[PDB]
Subunit: 61 residues, 6 copies
Amino acid sequence: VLYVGSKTKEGVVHGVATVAEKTKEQVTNVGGAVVTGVTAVAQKTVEGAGSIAAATGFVKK
Amino acid sequence: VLYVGSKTKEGVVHGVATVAEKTKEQVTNVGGAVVTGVTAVAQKTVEGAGSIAAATGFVKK
Amino acid sequence: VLYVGSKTKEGVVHGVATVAEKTKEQVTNVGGAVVTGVTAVAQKTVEGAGSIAAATGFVKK
Amino acid sequence: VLYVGSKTKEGVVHGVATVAEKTKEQVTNVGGAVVTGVTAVAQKTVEGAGSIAAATGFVKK
Amino acid sequence: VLYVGSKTKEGVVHGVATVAEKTKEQVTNVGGAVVTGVTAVAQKTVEGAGSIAAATGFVKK
Amino acid sequence: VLYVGSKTKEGVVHGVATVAEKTKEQVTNVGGAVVTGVTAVAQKTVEGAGSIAAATGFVKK
Ligand SMILES: CNc1ccc(-c2nc3ccc(O)cc3s2)cc1
Ligand SMILES: CNc1ccc(-c2nc3ccc(O)cc3s2)cc1
């Protein structure tokens, strides 16, 4: 009943240096799902299902 | 009843240096799921199922 | 009833230097699930099933 | 007598990512020479003395 | 007499990722020479004395 | 008389990832020479004396 947050950090990314020399990149998706190339990403959920880089499947019923 | 957080860190990424020299990258997905290339990612969930880089399957019923 | 966190760290990644010289990368997925290339990732869950890099299977019913 | 340069590179800097988090920087020079903080610098001389970051001395005669 | 350069590289820096978290930096020079903090520097001289980060002395005669 | 350079490299630095977490840095020079902190530096000289990070002395005559 006296919660005290201070200087806290949650789902935090900082201080990222990145060099990506690539002569070629290619995704050849044929009918499917694909997720590629996530970098320096931060989420924070409450009462929820939190996905960052999901390759979810073809739901059939 | 007197919770005290201070300078805490949770799901935190920091101080990442990355060099990626690649002459070729390729994902040739044919009908499937794929997740590739996650870097410096941070999540934090509460009352939820948290996935970062899932390759989930084709749900059939 | 007098919880005290201080300078704590949970699901934390820091101070990562990475060099990846690769002349070729390739994922040739045909109908399946794949997860590749996770680096410097941090999660924190509460009351939830937390997966980082799962290759989950084709749920059939 | 048939010099052929092609795609040559000389005194070349490229592809530099830099993060510098600093809570304090200070140079307290009292009567002297100082050089600090050179980053991503490129020179090319011909028939000359080329210095990049010199701390040269008090010439007296 | 048929010199052929091609795709040559000389005094070349490339693909540098750098993270520098520092709570304090300080140079307290009192009467002297100092050189500090050179990063990703490239030179190329011909018929000349080439110094990069010299701390040269007090020439007296 | 048929010199052929090709894809040569000389005085070359590439693919350097560096993380430097330092709570304090300090150079307290009193009357002297100092060189500190050289990183990813490349030189190339011809008919010349090439120094990179010299701490040269007080020339007296
Ligand atoms: C959003 N959903 C949620 C539910 C519950 C919580 C927490 N329950 C407790 C119990 C004891 C304790 O020392 C800390 C905590 S935090 C946090 C979030
Ligand atoms: C500007 N000052 C200068 C003087 C001389 C030169 C060179 N002399 C030679 C001799 C033979 C050889 O195979 C290459 C070279 S390059 C380059 C520059």
